[PDB]
Write a protein that binds this ligand. Structure first.
Ligand SMILES: Nc1nc2c(ncn2[C@H]2C[C@H](O)[C@@H](COP(=O)(O)O)O2)c(=O)[nH]1
Ligand SMILES: [Ca+2]
Ligand SMILES: [Ca+2]
Ligand SMILES: [Ca+2]
Length: 341
DNA sequence: GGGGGAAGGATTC
DNA sequence: CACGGAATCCTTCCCCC
């Protein structure tokens, strides 16, 4: 099996650059303004000009502005980026019908048929890179290997605007030398749990008693890491299906007042329903981000579809359940609809 | 003992 | 100071054969 992974470079910001080319070369910072106070919020993404100075996704807009006061700061326009993304995905869809659209800027291609051996794969990558740059003016990084995980890792090592192949020889080299934190799906939480078990490299997972691994990071994650170390990971390429649609907003002030939170919750509901399409959900969850950035939620699954009236009514009950069972003041509030009919 | 949901939380990107 | 949005996974609880 030959997997070719495509990852769009600093996507949101690059799109802004495409829509306003005079931005090229300047530090571009795409932000999610929360509205709590001037420049409150965080960086969704930044181009490399900004990233080389420390301005990257996750940092407060206020911090970024202290580092780069003269950079271009733009509000995130999700809808625009999503339409551009869809156009790029269709284009790849013609390089294979075996495609996995992992996110707004990542897709995996099973080019096991369209090619044989890594020479042609690499050639096909450049074809894809040049095609996308040509038709959309978007640069992307291509990663190629035997499975999804190493194809992605390949891209992680080649970005930005690169292409790379990890063949059956390097895979083994990485299995013992690749820092395990750099393995997809291994975040900071898991990375630390594995460090405490003496696991710093993928191969170390084979020196531990499985039942201990399972105990520490869960069975799924355990089998995942073990399979990769045995050089046996081989999940198939297939675009998952949207299983949930939702919206969460930040209130001006943290609150615990119902009549004060509602308008936010209802706005969340209104946007969620618009996003729903003609999809009808049978489950609804109210999600609240507490004052100490803790996430709490209460939901309910109905034996039938939820109309917007029912959603408005149930959400209030769920919200009251949250306020009732959690003392902290509330900072962000939203809803999520799932179990579509 | 264990299938099958549902619920609330934990994690990742 | 720290936004969002969604998928997996986990663990707990529950009904019940
Ligand atoms: N809103 C938001 N989006 C992010 C963050 N990190 C990455 N992304 C998005 C940018 C796009 C996609 C690229 O991969 O991931 C983040 O911290 N906040
Ligand atoms: Ca990516
Ligand atoms: Ca990217
Ligand atoms: Ca990591």
């Amino acid at each position: 099996m030959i997997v070719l992974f495509v990852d769009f470079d600093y996507f949101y910001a690059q799109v802004e650059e495409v829509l306003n080319p005079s931005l090229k070369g300047k530090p571009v910072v795409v932000c999610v303004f929360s509205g709590r106070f001037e420049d409150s919020g965080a960086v969704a993404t930044a181009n490399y000009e900004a990233r080389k100075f420390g301005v990257k996704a996750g940092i407060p807009i206020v911090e970024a502005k202290k580092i780069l006061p003269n950079a271009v700061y733009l509000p995130m326009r999700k809808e625009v980026y999503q339409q551009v993304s869809s156009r790029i995905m269709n284009l790849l869809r013609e390089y294979s019908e075996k495609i996995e659209i992992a996110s707004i800027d990542e897709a995996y291609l099973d080019i096991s048929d369209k090619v044989r051996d890594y020479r042609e794969a690499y050639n096909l990558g450049l074809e894809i890179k040049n095609k996308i740059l040509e038709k959309e003016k978007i640069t992307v990084t291509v990663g190629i290997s035997k499975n999804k995980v190493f194809a992605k890792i390949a891209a992680d090592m080649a970005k930005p605007n690169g292409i790379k192949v990890i063949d059956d020889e390097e895979v083994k080299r990485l299995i013992r030398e690749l820092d395990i934190a750099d393995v997809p799906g291994i975040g900071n939480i898991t990375a630390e749990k594995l460090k405490k078990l003496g696991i710093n490299k993928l191969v170390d997972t084979l020196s531990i008693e499985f039942d201990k691994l399972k105990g520490m990071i869960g069975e799924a994650k355990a089998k995942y890491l073990i399979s990769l170390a045995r050089d046996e990971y081989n999940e198939p390429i297939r675009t998952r299906v949207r299983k949930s649609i939702g919206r969460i907003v930040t209130m001006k002030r943290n609150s615990r007042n119902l009549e004060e939170i509602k308008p936010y919750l209802f706005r969340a509901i209104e946007e969620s329903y618009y996003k729903l399409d003609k999809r009808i959900p049978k489950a609804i969850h109210v999600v609240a981000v507490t004052e100490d950035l803790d996430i709490v939620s209460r939901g309910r699954t109905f034996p039938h579809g939820i109309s917007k009236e029912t959603a408005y009514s149930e959400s209030v009950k769920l919200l009251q359940k949250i306020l009732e069972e959690d003392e902290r003041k509330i900072r962000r509030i939203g809803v999520r609809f799932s179990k579509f009919i």
